[PDB]
């Protein structure tokens, strides 16, 4: 299970989480994008969520299985590795001081993090062939922004565990012979 379907499932789940959060906290509108734009782009002035992959851990010695093809008299060797990968989730939202109804980018980040940690979410995810570990920290960072106005860029890290498969060929034996000496 390689990257492309991982990203597709992750964006679907993030869209569902943001649809829930919009009902919960009443944002104007939301948008989910990646932080890996191959083409020059210009960002959006809407409550946005971002994701990106940092690195990978093999987590265990490879496990090999043997499946026999009778017609061609060959063993098909399947190797499985239990991979752990790390994703960074971050959000942006600009605070308008005049509006009385206040919602923070930190609120959106906290709600998105809490959604993925619920039991029901994990039960839904399990049938998509991956699972999530515990999240331990969320941080707020302040930057100057292109309008020379301070704002926050909260972020946190998530861990997703899955399996990777490759296949190879190997010869097969069908009999045994021996010699006994003394």
């Amino acid at each position: 299970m390689f990257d492309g379907e991982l990203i597709a499932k992750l964006v679907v789940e993030l869209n569902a989480a943001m649809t829930s959060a919009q009902e919960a906290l009443q944002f104007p509108d939301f948008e989910v994008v990646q932080k890996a734009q191959p083409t020059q782009q210009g960002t959006s002035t809407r409550p946005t969520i971002f994701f990106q992959k940092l690195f990978d851990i093999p987590r265990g010695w490879p496990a090999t299985d043997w499946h026999l093809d009778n017609t061609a008299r060959k063993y098909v060797e399947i190797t499985r590795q239990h991979v752990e990968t790390t994703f960074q989730i971050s959000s942006l939202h600009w605070q308008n001081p005049e509006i009385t109804h206040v919602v923070t980018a930190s609120d959106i980040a906290n709600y998105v993090r809490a959604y993925f940690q619920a039991r029901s979410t994990i039960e839904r995810v399990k049938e998509l062939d991956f699972l999530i570990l515990r999240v331990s920290q969320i941080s707020n960072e302040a930057f100057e922004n292109d309008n020379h106005q301070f704002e926050f860029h909260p972020s946190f890290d998530m861990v997703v565990t899955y399996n990777q498969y490759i296949r190879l060929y190997e010869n097969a034996a069908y009999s045994a012979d021996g010699v006994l000496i003394g």
């Binding site: 492309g4 990203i7 597709a8 964006v11 989910v32 994008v33 990646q34 890996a36 734009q37 191959p38 083409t39 020059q40 782009q41 210009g42 960002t43 959006s44 002035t45 994701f51």
Partner: protein, 123 residues
């Protein structure tokens, strides 16, 4: 005077080139959270193209010379905002990063050489 277009009358002396210019309209997603942009109706524009003349660098064994071009045109063209950029090609696709005195009479341009053009009469 910031009235009549100065680049308009200047182009009557020096002599210019011809480029194909296309503007940005809107963008969508490709079920990967990656933006894919789309442009509309490329047309012919008269402009003067200059040099800034790249020198390369290294990261490790990788040279990566970045190609640059400077273009003067009497068009109100945008390089970047919450929307996309514009495109051109003297011989290969390019994209620019700047602005200039558009709301009066003319602007100035940039350009980074993208890979190639499609072909078939240089689409």
């Amino acid at each position: 005077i910031p009235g009549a277009n100065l680049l308009r009358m200047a182009f009557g002396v020096i002599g210019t080139q011809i480029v194909r210019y296309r503007k940005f309209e809107q963008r969508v997603k490709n079920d990967q959270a990656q933006y894919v942009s789309m442009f509309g109706e490329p047309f012919d524009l008269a402009a003067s193209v200059q040099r800034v003349r790249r020198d390369q660098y290294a990261q490790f064994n990788l040279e990566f010379q970045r190609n640059y071009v400077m273009i003067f045109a009497n068009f109100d063209m945008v390089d970047l905002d919450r929307n996309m950029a514009g495109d051109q090609f003297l011989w290969t696709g390019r994209v620019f990063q700047l602005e200039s005195q558009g709301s009066w009479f003319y602007q100035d341009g940039w350009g980074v050489c993208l890979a190639v053009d499609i072909g078939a009469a240089k689409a």
